[PDB]
Write a protein that binds this ligand. Structure first.
Ligand code: HEC
Ligand code: HEC
Length: 187
């Protein structure tokens, strides 16, 4: 029922300036959206438009999406969810070996579970549907700076999610910077 063609024009005329027309943003401030899951894109946009998601730089996006209809946001969500994801590159000096170990096997000493167990072996996440009561957003190729910022919001409680708040608070700045670096290069 969602109209991907209309979603295309919305992304082209509204979102592209920050997130790119395919969702593969080139500015580390604007998170990637290509192949992010439909319900996740939809609810995050609505939250930013409606003043519920306030942390970080959400304030620059809210005015631009203020007069988008709910159907408009659903259409551009379905559009972005079908795009092909591009990845950044892992910085060899940002301990990508530790990042990979956090991602694939967690940090058992600090009860940090492997990110991959929810976010997938390529960081594709999991969409909602079926009898699944819990979906997981895509992370692969996401800008490392954005990842660290969200992880900090979860740490401080500026962003709410009991699962991620508990995970982020068990980790160190070094842990976050490493796993973020690895995630940027996940293709
Ligand atoms: C520049 C003024 C932007 C415009 C135009 C659009 N977005 Fe945006 N968006 C922008 C920023 C700076 C951020 C991050 C805020 C933060 O927490 O620091 C976002 C975030 C999103 C997200 C969440 C992504 C995620 O959680 O991984 C989504 C789903 C999103 N934005 C959607 C979106 C849409 C659909 C847009 C066109 C209608 C759009 N944004 C435009 C900045 C800007
Ligand atoms: C299942 C128990 C999970 C584990 C293991 C990890 N994450 Fe997760 N993540 C999970 C959920 C249910 C959500 C969405 C919550 C919400 O606020 O909507 C997330 C989200 C994130 C994000 C934000 C993504 C964004 O686009 O803004 C990040 C940066 C993230 N998760 C990182 C992350 C890392 C680094 C993990 C391994 C240490 C990890 N997650 C594990 C569920 C689960």
């Amino acid at each position: 029922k969602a109209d991907v063609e209309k979603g295309k024009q919305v992304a082209a005329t509204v979102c592209a300036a920050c997130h790119a027309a395919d969702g593969n943003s080139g500015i580390a401030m604007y998170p990637r959206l290509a192949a992010q899951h439909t319900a996740y894109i939809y609810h995050q946009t609505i939250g930013i438009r409606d003043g519920k998601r306030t942390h970080g730089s959400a304030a620059v996006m809210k005015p631009v999406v203020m007069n988008l209809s709910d159907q408009d946001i659903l259409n551009v969500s379905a559009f972005y969810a079908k795009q092909q994801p591009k990845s950044g590159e892992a910085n060899p000096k940002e301990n990508p070996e530790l990042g990979a170990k956090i991602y694939r096997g967690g940090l058992s000493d600090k009860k940090v579970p492997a990110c991959m167990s929810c976010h997938g072996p390529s960081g594709a996440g999991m969409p909602g549907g079926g009898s699944e009561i819990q979906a997981y957003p895509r992370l692969g190729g996401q800008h490392q700076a954005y990842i660290v910022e969200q992880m900090n919001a979860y740490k401080s409680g500026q962003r709410k999610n009991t699962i991620m708040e508990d995970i982020a608070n068990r980790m160190s700045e070094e842990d976050l910077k490493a796993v973020a670096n690895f995630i940027q290069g996940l293709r």
